[PDB]
Every structure is written in structure tokens, then in C-alpha cells.
């Protein structure tokens, strides 16, 4: 590290992410459960997977982000399956695309993105929700696969 790298947010394709500047490779894949991850809230449950689908018996097996509403029982998809995942200024990032969309002024289809981050000791990661439900859901994941 120089300290002179620009911040830049690369991105890597099925599961993996790799940077060129820096010389970083990871792969997410053992850290993908294909049953999946899953976050509660008192508004909503959340069920995410690093790359993929998330399992659900309630969620189509084509989403990779997807929330059970506990206050009101609906379900809505963050985002379709998918496996991208980015880095950005040594902060691995995982943004699922195509989700169910909301009243708001761009029309966006409902987007998660998590933010694995690497604090000091952690596994694979649970991944934990932020506040934002607003539009952008990001999700706060402590991994110490995050750590080069």
C-alpha cells in the first residue's frame, strides 16, 4: 500500500473479485451458503447469499436477496441472483441487482449491497442490517475473508 490508490471500486464476476492495483484475489464461494444467510429486523427478515441464490421456501431459488416482512408478511426481492462481487478502496463489496421495485422517483428495482468488512476477528461473516430500507439496502457483514 502506498496510500496514493485511488479509490476506485472494482469488480470482479461469479463469486470472486479480484483487483488488479493491488493485487488482491478473493473468492466468496466457501463463505456462499446455498441455504443461505438470514437477518431479522422487527419490520423485516432478511435472507442474503454472497453470490447466487438464497434457499427460501417462500423466495424464488433465481433471487439473491430476499425479505419476509414480519410486521406485515409480505415478501419482496432485493435483488435477482446474481454473483458479482466488487471492491472498493480495500472494502469488499456485494451489490444484487433486480430486486422488487418501490414507489420512487427513478423507478429502481429494489438493489442490496453489502459491505464485508474485516473488524478485527470474525468467520465466514453474519451479515447484519444497517437502516436503510429507504432504496439502497446495505448490509453490514463482518468477514475475515475481508482481510488480505
Given at each position: 500500500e502506498a496510500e496514493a490508490e485511488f479509490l476506485s471500486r472494482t469488480e470482479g464476476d461469479n463469486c470472486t473479485v479480484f483487483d488488479?492495483?493491488?493485487g488482491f484475489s478473493f473468492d466468496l464461494t466457501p463463505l456462499t451458503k446455498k441455504d443461505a444467510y438470514k437477518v431479522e429486523t422487527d419490520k423485516y427478515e432478511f435472507h442474503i447469499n454472497v453470490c447466487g441464490p438464497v434457499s427460501v421456501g417462500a423466495c424464488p431459488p433465481d433471487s439473491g436477496?430476499?425479505?419476509v416482512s414480519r410486521s406485515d408478511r409480505k415478501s419482496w426481492n432485493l435483488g435477482r441472483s446474481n454473483a458479482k462481487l466488487s471492491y472498493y478502496d480495500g472494502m469488499i463489496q456485494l451489490t444484487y441487482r433486480d430486486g422488487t421495485p418501490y414507489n420512487n422517483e427513478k423507478r429502481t428495482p429494489?438493489?442490496?449491497l453489502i459491505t464485508f468488512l474485516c473488524d478485527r476477528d470474525a468467520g465466514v461473516g453474519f451479515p447484519e442490517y444497517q437502516e436503510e430500507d429507504n432504496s439502497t439496502y446495505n448490509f453490514r457483514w463482518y468477514t475475515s475473508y475481508a482481510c488480505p
Open positions: 488488479s492495483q493491488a436477496a430476499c425479505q429494489r438493489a442490496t
